[PDB]
From Swiss-Prot, chain A:
Changing residue 9 to C: Resistant to antibiotics salinamide A and B. Changing residue 4 to S/T: Resistant to antibiotics salinamide A and B. Co-administration of salinamide and rifampicin or salinamide and myxopyronin suppresses the emergence of resistance to both antibiotics. This is DNA-directed RNA polymerase subunit beta'. It comes from Escherichia coli (strain K12). Changing residue 26 to C: Resistant to antibiotics salinamide A and B. Belongs to the RNA polymerase beta' chain family.
Curated annotation (Swiss-Prot), chain D:
Interacts with the RNA polymerase core enzyme and RssB. This is RNA polymerase sigma factor RpoS. Keywords: Cytoplasm, DNA-binding, Sigma factor, Stress response, Transcription, Transcription regulation. Sigma factors are initiation factors that promote the attachment of RNA polymerase to specific initiation sites and are then released. This sigma factor is the master transcriptional regulator of the stationary phase and the general stress response. Controls, positively or negatively, the expression of several hundred genes, which are mainly involved in metabolism, transport, regulation and stress management. Protects stationary phase cells from killing induced by endoribonuclease MazF. GO terms for cellular component: cytoplasm; cytosolic DNA-directed RNA polymerase complex; sigma factor antagonist complex. A motif (Interaction with polymerase core subunit RpoC) lies at residues 66-69. GO terms for molecular function: bacterial-type RNA polymerase core enzyme binding; DNA binding; sigma factor activity. The chain holds residues 53 to 328 of 330 of the full protein. Disruption phenotype: Stationary phase cells lose resistance to killing by endoribonuclease MazF.
From Swiss-Prot, chain E:
Its EC number is 2.7.7.6. It comes from Escherichia coli O157:H7. HAMAP family: RNApol_bact_RpoB. GO terms for molecular function: DNA binding; DNA-directed RNA polymerase activity; ribonucleoside binding. GO terms for cellular component: DNA-directed RNA polymerase complex. This is DNA-directed RNA polymerase subunit beta. The keyword Nuclease does not apply. It catalyses: RNA(n) + a ribonucleoside 5'-triphosphate = RNA(n+1) + diphosphate. The RNAP catalytic core consists of 2 alpha, 1 beta, 1 beta' and 1 omega subunit. When a sigma factor is associated with the core the holoenzyme is formed, which can initiate transcription. The keyword Transcription applies. Keywords: Acetylation, DNA-directed RNA polymerase, Nucleotidyltransferase, Transcription, Transferase. The modification N6-acetyllysine is found at residues 1020, 1198.
Length: 50, 251, 50, 277, 1340
DNA sequence: TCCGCGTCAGACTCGTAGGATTATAGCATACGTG
DNA sequence: ACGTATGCTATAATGTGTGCAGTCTGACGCGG
């Protein structure tokens, strides 16, 4: 986004500043669940050969 | 096998078997009649469809769906992949002398110690109570020792407390990433349904006291008691195998 | 590659325990191969000493 | 081209005779007197009729390919026993056979637990009576409500409904989510775990020591009777086969062994303690 | 302001006056199912639609037919009360009128031959409560609204199917409501293809040929025309100046008089206006230019009659000369352009191997039914059946609407079937996008994600019932006799009943209501999912779906979704969000008229949101006028920037519309990271209601709205005075203005008393009103399990202090005082339901008597003679609740048992044992027991004692109904009689049974006395049949499963206390396990002495970035500071005027406080009942984003004579010496999550074993050992610990020899390894042998 | 032998929750065991 | 005798279809 978030957590986010924070928040936590399987599957792959 | 509810239950193999036998016997019947070949052809195609569906259902064509519109589990399926015998019922096993529970902090414990609930360790060390009981002469037989434990009488706590001393227990946290995902400690009986874990080794498990559960396992054999104290004890496991660096570090 | 190096070991038990289990067994059946057990997966399966 | 077993057969019937009234009679007259080729034709010809009859008897028990095979066997028994001399058509006579042979073969291979026709035939009338009632009662009929309209037994209706009770496969997922089936829950009946195995082993070993600790002539007519040490569980009168050869003295010695053993259970700390069990 | 509000007012720090008041939160669920049953006369909706759609059904011959007339709902067999208890669906009879009409065959259509007509039952439909729940088999269950791809048309493009080419291949796809799919797609060579059902790929001109389109017509539809005239000798060509645009002059371009562009030169916009103003129409051209151009229409030699050149063939020099001398000096060719008007259909026809219409229907038929030899009718029937039959295909209203507005059409509402026009129009816009104009739609836009609530889904499932009946009707009609066969003999009631119960049970959307909290009920009914049937899958689910889309604004909550693999798909609905009449979502918006922000509101669709520019609610209104500032921060087109005043068209109504219900309850959400905010709103739903409902000191205001709309409380239907207060029920007398003149006017509210929840927790309704209190219409009369004066009370607030404590708050670990445990405030209730089943085994029937073999008098002490435990009897694990005995078969009494049964005698008779005993570990109090018996075998004596109560309690309860209803009915007549014949005591001499005897003069009030007289009799006669229904349903034998004879259901009531292991959290996602319940001696305490309740870790804050909890703490402390001042004045017993000044000074402090509550309006008595509730602490409301800021909180802290900082001087309890420096202390509203340790901990030594794997079972549910998976295994392999693993592969798991052998060795003391080889492997051997593979164990 | 497109293989690890189907006629001798 | 199983009916009828269609990266295996 061309316009970033000016406020902080002490000052309080406005309504959009939170809406904007969501986009990054949900996708960061989506890659906590889904991307772990590729990395956990790597553990499996490595082990069998070694 | 029959359910408690008067219902029965059968595996999908029995169902797939009945498809094979029916069609095979119907072919015997049609070869008795010397039927025209066009029909014999269908019967042979059918027979193959049933056999191929029995060995590996979902492969040649549509897998034969059953009652709940789902596909029948074939033979190959019980040897196939995660859900097969290998990964699920052979390399992976549910195990006796095992319990799990919410963990909480143990800031009083030393490194080689961990809080173990009494009623947990009670059930866990059940055959060790019956054993030390016959030695003292408090139990003449084992169903006598069984009732002694059940009544939870005062003097049974003191025997349980006797066997547990100088006895390590394995503490596992999911998921088991590296070897340090299991470490052994000397159980300390505590009144309460919560396990109490040492803060410094929290790093190895990645165990956050935000509602984590840890599986307990009792090493039965003397070799397992030595292995747990020698290899898997928390004091003998300091540095990470990945990097020659201490994972046991305050935070 | 890892996925391939696991299926290459003379131990077919170690290979089927991994993946491609439908293929491993058929190739091992036709060859008539006998696994004399060296790996860990092999002896953990049978429940013997590692 | 075509690699569906369904469409292949359905192709081959689509290229088969479609017989006229006098044609049917010509072939059929020779078919009874065994023309070989004739019996093959009438059959080949009316496979198309079997398919249209299995189109209405589908989605109920077995697949469409299983109804056609057993429907073909009805057309064959119809050809083994048709009357060409009669002025009535064949398509009419063969339909009675193809509808029967299908219904019968479904009644057998539909249920896992084999249900003979007798129990089944009746079940249907109980179920078809439930239809009538359901529409006018607007309430699915009870075992009683079905019994009151037929004026038949209560347990009959109920026991016939017990055989209708259908199955869940052991390998069926739970909660519409591949997580665990019923086999990963359902316990094993036969084998009770070590605790129950060692119960009997320890209980019996203590008994062996109790017999050796008791009188030698008191545990010789007690364990040999109940079949504890001996090989067969005999009775008071049958212990005479061993060495006792008595009826009164066997009964006094049996009870004398039990009286001294009842004091052995009061002193060890059981008696009323092991009486609850 | 109201009375129930006068008792306790919440100080509101809002500064954005609510123009729109929060709607009923359970709007969707109730309105949706309301449509389904709604018998609309014409505008078919729900069932009425389902019948008109399928019906009328006619035989396969078409001589007889069944026609739908009308349907109806009978009142429920068992009401909610009964249904919840017995355990069968709360459903209503479906009676539909059918009409069997039969025609004459040789005659034309003898319609009037036998018009048979009758009414028929088919299936019982589960009804919806007033809570928006379905009672299925005695479980209030909720059906979640689905979110699916909206039918119509959709343009997509895999931005690189083959990154080999890396070409953006564009594709179109027609998605119907019912029917086959229709896709169009390009390829590396830009050849248009069509793939019905995404099956085979077929050239896209084959479908057009099937719609009867000659090669010529096809070209004429898509491509434009280029005219070529051969005049005398010079070849000439028509030029629209705007054609050789952005191309190169391959030849010398010269006109009537002028050379414009030179060979090999780009024709610019200048050259185009040069030619266009000169009015150029014709240009002479070379013959080498046509070589490459495609001829359009066919050209036969006028002379011979043969095609010189067929349509769509690339011309050459020799073909053109053959055409010039044939006698055609007017040629038509294609306007091909590699840049704009692209030649696709042209190159596609060259691939297209078909010929005419009839041949095009062949390859279409050879695709879908390959192998069957095709005929004229089979090929035609199939294609016509796909997208062109009223039966197979249906776009629906939404389908045709989205389909039309996607093609920028003329119609909103049109035909369910695809017309020829539609298909080609779709191919056209696909080709438009390919050219450059037109944008593809994106699926994540909610304009393409439609919402389908229960009612629409219930409609769909009800159709399949009708479809499955259609089969049985047609086949029975044709061959069956016409006359004899009745219409109900052909109908079946099971296929409809089974197909609907399939939905109300097996479906992923039909799941058990999460009712462990009012917030859980209301947020779970407002759940919306993309999963289950006709949706998506974790296996299939991508990322961009899950991601928050700027359409969500105002419609869906950005922070409300599980953090599990089902993360982005599941989502709660926004606060003020509502469904579009067609299906999409829509959000309220304040219209701006000529700059003036008008109070008129418009719910803008997902589509029209993008159009207008929308100001934010942060923007300031000028108190009826316009935006105070010239520049306003607004948003549109899915982006955000500043705009001028006149440019603003709309504005966000409230500041809470972005978020959901779950999130609207979090105070200071504005100071909380979205990641922790999500977890906080997710755990707030898991908050088990406490023993004593404690109101939240630090709320948002939404509290009351949730508690009331959840339908868990009992709110007043009509205002008036509470005639009677009771723990079980409430009786209210209605005021004259509201009360109807017909009836008596006395409402009855029998409050739900303590009974179970779906999560095994308490459900109570306590009266929140005093005896004889004046109550206004729509006021909360009784509070729920988690509500307090109507406001939501999920958990409890307490004095908290942020600081470490000897590591007892290490990683978010919690240190709670014993004083919290002493007040039993976080102590919870758990109503557990257990059952005892008497079955019919092969050996014989079971019964229920006190006679149980092998038992202590101690066990049968709490039981009665019948064999059921007394009401109020405390029970513990091992004690038997209900005595049961089953038949014992041929039993092999082992020699050691025959001797033991002969010594201690007690020769037990042919009978077994299976009594229902308290599960090992549970202990509570039996609060009630219910007995269900089949209609037959004689009853238990306890079952008769319970019938005694139900009856005699119902006789009393109905006596009380007719009694108080009488008193309210004569109370009216008494007032009517005075009007006219005024006589007080003389009228009240004789009894009240002779009052209908007295009358009045010819008057309206004489007609009133007749109404009340015959209505008194109406209730008097009604009372008997009300008694009949009660009496019968108590005598009625309750229908049970086959095999079952009778059942006894016990209700326990466990009181679990908080303890180490219990998981608690705030509402800012701040999790934690209680590690230690500190002694009151050891708890830190302020200079003044009162101790702290919980000690939290300050490190669970920076990393987390959820500063809302600290603000919750500070305000909570300020709020309490004010309660502590009010508490002191009420203790000191001061004055009404002194409290008035201070409390007025408290309510009015904020900058622009929303509520301006004057206390000069409040009477003295009304002030003191208010202050008495304010003393625990002044409840404060901090709207989600319009909450309080530091200036306001620190100003409130000065009123409370609290520190500005919020940090207090704390002293260590252990010691007494002060801590080295101040610590934040305040009141944080924390919660007790359902994850309690008593429900967690498990232990096993040896127990059950699996059926084939022969390893132990799984879970504490079945008493199973923990799984040691392969990952757990590799850990021991790494250690080197070999036995520890082999021990966990064999003796602890399968090894049947090992497990029992090892057990015996441990009790001997000899912990000795004795392996053999797991059964699960011995299984794998035979399993591979069963697959026809020789797998034997080759020895040494 | 190379290119296109068909099938076929994987997708971290442990804890907990609860529910239900349709229908196969109708009647008379043929085949198996106390 | 009781339970199960086998057997026949005679208007004419003669070729099925059914049901989820945002998975995806990566890897071969048959033709063309
Ligand atoms: Mg955690």
């Amino acid at each position: 986004i061309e316009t970033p978030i000016t406020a902080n957590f002490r000052e309080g986010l406005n309504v959009l500043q939170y809406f904007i924070s969501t986009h990054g928040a949900r996708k960061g936590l989506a890659d906590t669940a889904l991307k772990t399987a590729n990395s956990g599957y790597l553990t499996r792959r490595l082990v069998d050969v070694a | 096998v029959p359910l408690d509810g008067g219902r029965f239950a059968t595996s999908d193999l029995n169902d797939l078997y009945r498809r094979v036998i029916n069609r095979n016997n119907r072919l015997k019947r049609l070869l008795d009649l010397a039927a025209p070949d066009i029909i014999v052809r269908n019967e042979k195609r059918m027979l193959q469809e049933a056999v191929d569906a029995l060995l590996d259902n979902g492969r040649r064509g549509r897998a034969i769906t059953g009652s709940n519109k789902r596909p029948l589990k074939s033979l190959a399926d019980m040897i196939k992949g995660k859900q097969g015998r290998f990964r699920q019922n052979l390399l992976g096993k549910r195990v006796d002398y095992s319990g799990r529970s919410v963990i909480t902090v143990g800031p009083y414990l030393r490194l080689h110690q961990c809080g173990l609930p009494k009623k947990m360790a009670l059930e866990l060390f059940k055959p060790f109570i019956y054993g030390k009981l016959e030695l003292r002469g408090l139990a003449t037989t084992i169903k006598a020792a069984k009732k002694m434990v059940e009544r939870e009488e005062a003097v049974v706590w003191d025997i349980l407390d006797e066997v547990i001393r100088e006895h390590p227990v394995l503490l596992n946290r999911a998921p088991t990433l590296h070897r340090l995902g299991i470490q052994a400690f000397e159980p300390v009986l505590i009144e309460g349904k919560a396990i109490q874990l040492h803060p410094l080794v929290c790093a190895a498990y990645n165990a956050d006291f935000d509602g984590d559960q840890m599986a307990v396992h009792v090493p039965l054999t003397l070799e397992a008691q030595l292995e747990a104290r020698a290899l898997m004890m928390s004091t003998n496991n300091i540095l990470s195998p990945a990097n020659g660096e201490p994972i046991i570090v305050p935070s | 590659g890892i996925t391939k190096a696991s299926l290459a070991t003379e131990s077919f038990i170690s290979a089927a325990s991994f993946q491609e289990t439908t293929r491993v067994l058929t190739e091992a059946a036709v060859a008539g191969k006998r696994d004399e057990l060296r790996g860990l997966k092999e002896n953990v399966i049978v429940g013997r000493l590692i | 081209r075509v690699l569906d077993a369904t469409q292949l057969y359905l192709g081959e019937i689509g290229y088969s005779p479609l017989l006229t009234a006098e044609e049917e009679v010509y072939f059929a007259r020779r078919a009874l007197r065994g023309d070989v080729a004739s019996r093959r034709r009438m059959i080949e010809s009316n496979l198309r009729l079997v398919v249209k009859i299995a189109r209405r008897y589908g989605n109920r028990g077995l697949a469409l390919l299983d109804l056609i095979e057993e429907g073909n066997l009805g057309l064959i028994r119809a050809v083994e026993k048709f009357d060409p001399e009669r002025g009535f058509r064949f398509s009419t006579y063969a339909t009675w056979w193809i509808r029967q042979t299908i219904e019968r073969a479904i009644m057998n291979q539909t249920r896992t637990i084999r249900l003979p026709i007798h129990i089944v035939k009746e079940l249907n009338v109980y179920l078809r009576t439930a239809r009538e009632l359901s529409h006018k009662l607007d309430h699915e009929p009870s075992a009683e409500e079905i019994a009151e309209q037929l004026d038949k037994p209560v347990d009959d209706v109920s026991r016939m409904l017990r055989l209708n009770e259908r199955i869940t496969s052991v390998d069926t997922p739970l909660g519409g989510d591949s997580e665990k089936a019923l086999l990963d829950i359902l316990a094993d009946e036969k084998e009770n775990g070590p605790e129950d195995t060692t119960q009997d082993d320890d209980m019996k070993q203590s008994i062996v020591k109790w017999l050796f600790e008791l009188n030698a002539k008191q545990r010789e007519v007690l364990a040999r009777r109940f079949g504890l040490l001996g090989y067969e569980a005999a009775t008071l009168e049958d212990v005479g086969r061993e060495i006792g050869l008595t009826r009164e003295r066997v009964r006094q010695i049996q009870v004398e062994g039990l009286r001294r053993l009842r004091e052995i259970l009061q002193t060890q700390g059981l008696n009323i303690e092991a009486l609850f069990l | 302001y109201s009375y129930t509000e006068k008792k306790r007012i919440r100080k509101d720090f809002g500064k954005r006056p609510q123009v729109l008041d929060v709607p009923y939160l359970l709007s969707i669920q109730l309105d949706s199912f309301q449509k389904f049953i709604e018998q609309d006369p014409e505008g078919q909706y729900g069932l009425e639609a389902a019948f008109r759609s399928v019906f009328p059904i006619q035989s396969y011959s078409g001589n007889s037919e069944l026609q739908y007339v009308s349907y109806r709902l009978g009142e429920p067999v068992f009401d909610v009360q009964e249904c919840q208890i017995r355990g069968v669906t709360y459903s209503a009879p479906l009676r539909v009128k059918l009409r069997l009409v039969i025609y004459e065959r040789e005659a034309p259509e003898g319609t009037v031959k036998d018009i048979k007509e009758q009414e028929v039952y088919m299936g019982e439909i589960p009804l919806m409560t007033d809570n928006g729940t379905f009672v299925i088999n005695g479980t209030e269950r909720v059906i979640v609204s689905q979110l699916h791809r909206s039918p119509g048309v959709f343009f997509d493009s895999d931005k690189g199917k083959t990154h080999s080419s890396g070409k953006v291949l564009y594709n179109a796809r027609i998605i119907p409501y019912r029917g086959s799919w229709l896709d169009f797609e390009f390829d590396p060579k830009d050849n248009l293809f069509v793939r019905i059902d995404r099956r085979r790929k077929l050239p896209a001109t084959i479908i057009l040929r099937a719609l009867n389109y000659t090669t010529e017509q096809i070209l004429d539809l898509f491509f434009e025309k280029v005219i070529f005239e051969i005049r005398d000798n010079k070849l000439q060509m028509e030029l629209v100046p705007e054609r050789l645009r952005g191309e190169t002059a391959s030849f010398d371009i010269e006109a009537n008089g002028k050379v414009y562009v030179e060979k090999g030169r780009r024709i610019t916009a200048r050259h185009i206006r040069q030619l266009e103003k000169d009015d150029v129409k014709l240009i002479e051209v070379p013959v080498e230019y046509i070589a490459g151009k495609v001829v359009a229409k066919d050209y036969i030699d006028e002379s011979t009659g043969e095609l010189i050149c067929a349509a769509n063939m690339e011309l050459s020099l020799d073909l053109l000369a053959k055409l010039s001398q044939s006698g055609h000096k007017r040629i038509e060719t294609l306007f091909t352009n590699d840049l704009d008007h692209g030649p696709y259909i042209s190159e596609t026809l060259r691939v297209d191997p078909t010929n005419d219409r009839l041949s095009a229907l062949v390859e279409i038929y050879r695709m879908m039914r390959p192998g069957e030899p095709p005929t004229r009718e089979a090929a035609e029937s199939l294609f016509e059946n796909l997208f062109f039959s009223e039966d197979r295909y249906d776009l629906s209203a939404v389908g045709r609407m989205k389909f039309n507005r996607s093609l920028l059409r003329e119609e909103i509402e049109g035909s369910g079937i695809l017309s020829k026009d539609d298909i080609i129009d779709v191919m056209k816009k696909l080709i438009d996008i390919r050219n450059g104009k037109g944008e593809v739609d994106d699926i994540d836009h909610l304009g393409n994600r439609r919402i389908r609530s229960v009612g629409e889904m219930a409609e769909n499932q009800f159709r399949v019932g009708l479809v499955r009946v259609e089969r049985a009707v047609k086949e029975r009609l044709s061959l069956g006799d016409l006359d004899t066969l009745m219409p109900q003999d052909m109908i079946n009631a099971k296929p409809i009943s089974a197909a609907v119960k399939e939905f109300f049970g097996s479906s992923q959307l039909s799941q058990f209501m999460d009712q462990n909290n009012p917030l859980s009920e209301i947020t779970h009914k407002r759940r919306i999912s993309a999963l289950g049937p006709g949706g998506l899958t974790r296996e299939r689910a991508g990322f961009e779906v899950r991601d928050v889309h700027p359409t969500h604004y105002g419609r869906v909550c950005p922070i409300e979704t599980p953090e599990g693999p089902n993360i982005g798909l599941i989502n709660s609905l926004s606060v003020y969000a509502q469904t579009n009449e067609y299906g999409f979502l829509e959000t309220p918006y304040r219209k701006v008229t000529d700059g003036v922000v008008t109070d008129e509101i418009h719910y803008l669709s997902a589509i029209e949101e993008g159009n207008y520019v929308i100001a934010q609610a942060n923007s300031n209104l000028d108190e009826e006028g316009h935006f105070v500032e010239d520049l306003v921060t607004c948003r549109s087109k899915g982006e955000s920037s500043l705009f001028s005043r006149d440019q603003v068209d709309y504005m966000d109504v409230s500041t809470q519309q972005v978020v959901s219900v779950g999130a609207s309850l979090i105070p200071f959400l504005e100071h909380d990271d979205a990641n922790r905010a999500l977890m906080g709103a997710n755990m707030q739903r898991q908050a088990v209601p406490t023993l004593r409902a404690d109101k939240p000191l630090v709320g948002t205001g939404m509290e009351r709205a949730v508690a009331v709309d959840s339908g868990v409380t009992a709110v007043a239907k009509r205002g008036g005075v509470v005639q009677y207060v009771d723990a079980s029920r409430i009786v209210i007398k209605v005021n004259e203005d509201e009360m109807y003149p017909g009836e008596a006017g006395i409402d009855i509210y029998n409050l739900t008393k303590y009974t179970r929840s779906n999560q095994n927790t308490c459900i109570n309704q306590m009266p929140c009103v005093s005896l004889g209190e004046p109550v206004e219409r729509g006021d909360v009369l009784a509070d729920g399990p988690s509500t307090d004066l109507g406001e939501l009370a999920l958990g409890q607030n307490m004095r908290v202090a942020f600081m470490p404590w000897n590591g007892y708050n290490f990683e978010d670990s919690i240190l709670v005082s014993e004083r919290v445990v002493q007040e039993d405030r976080f102590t919870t209730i758990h109503i557990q339901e257990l059952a005892c089943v008497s079955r019919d085994t092969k050996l014989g029937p079971e019964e229920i008597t006190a006679d149980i073999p092998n038992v202590g008098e101690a066990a049968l002490s709490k039981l009665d003679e019948s064999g059921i435990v007394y009401i109020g009897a405390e029970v513990t694990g091992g004690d038997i609740l209900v005595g049961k005995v089953t038949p014992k078969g041929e039993t092999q009494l082992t020699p050691e048992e025959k001797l033991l049964r002969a010594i201690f005698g007690e020769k037990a008779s042919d009978v077994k044992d299976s009594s229902l005993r308290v599960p090992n570990g549970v202990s509570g109090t039996v609060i009630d027991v219910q007995v269900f018996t089949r209609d037959g075998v004689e009853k238990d004596k306890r079952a008769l004692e319970i019938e005694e109560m139900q009856l005699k309690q119902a006789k009393k309860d109905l006596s009380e109904e007719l009694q108080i209803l009488e008193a309210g009915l004569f109370s009216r007549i008494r007032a009517v009689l005075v009007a006219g014949g005024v006589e007080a005591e003389k009228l009240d001499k004789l009894p009240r049974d002779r009052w209908l005897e007295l009358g009045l003069t010819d008057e309206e009030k004489q007609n009133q006395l007749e109404q009340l007289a015959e209505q008194y009799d109406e209730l008097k006669h009604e009372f008997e049949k009300k008694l009949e229904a009660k009496r019968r349903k108590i005598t009625q034998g309750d229908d049970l499963a086959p095999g079952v004879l009778k059942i006894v259901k016990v209700y326990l009531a466990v009181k679990r206390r908080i303890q180490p292991g219990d998981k608690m959290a705030g509402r800012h996602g701040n999790k934690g396990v209680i590690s230690k319940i500190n002694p009151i001696e050891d708890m830190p305490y302020d200079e003044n002495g009162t101790p702290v309740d919980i000690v939290l870790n300050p490190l669970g804050v920076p990393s987390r970035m959820n500063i809302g909890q600290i603000l919750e703490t500070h305000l909570g402390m300020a709020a309490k500071g004010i309660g502590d001042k009010i508490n002191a004045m009420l203790k000191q017993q001061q004055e009404v005027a002194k409290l008035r000044e201070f409390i007025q000074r408290a309510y009015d402090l904020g900058a622009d406080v929303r509520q301006k509550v004057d206390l000069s309006t409040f009477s003295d008595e009304e002030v003191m009942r208010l202050a008495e509730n304010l003393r625990k602490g002044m409840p404060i409301a901090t709207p989600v984003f319009d909450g309080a800021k530091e200036a306001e909180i620190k100003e409130l802290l000065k009123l409370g004579d609290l520190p500005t900082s919020g940090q207090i001087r704390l002293y260590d309890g252990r010691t007494g010496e002060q801590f080295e420096r101040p610590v934040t202390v305040g009141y944080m509203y924390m919660l007790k999550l359902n994850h309690l340790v008593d429900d967690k901990m498990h232990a096993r030594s040896t127990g059950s074993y699996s059926l084939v794997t022969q390893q132990p079972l799984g879970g504490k549910a079945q008493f199973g050992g923990q799984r040691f998976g392969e990952m757990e295994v590799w850990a021991l392999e790494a250690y080197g610990a070999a036995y520890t693993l082999q021990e966990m592969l064999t003796v602890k798991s399968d090894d049947v020899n090992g497990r029992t052998k090892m057990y015996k060795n441990i009790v001997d003391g000899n912990h000795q390894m004795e392996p053999g080889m797991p059964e699960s492997f011995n299984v794998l051997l035979k399993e591979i042998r069963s697959l026809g593979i020789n797998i034997e164990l080759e020895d040494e």
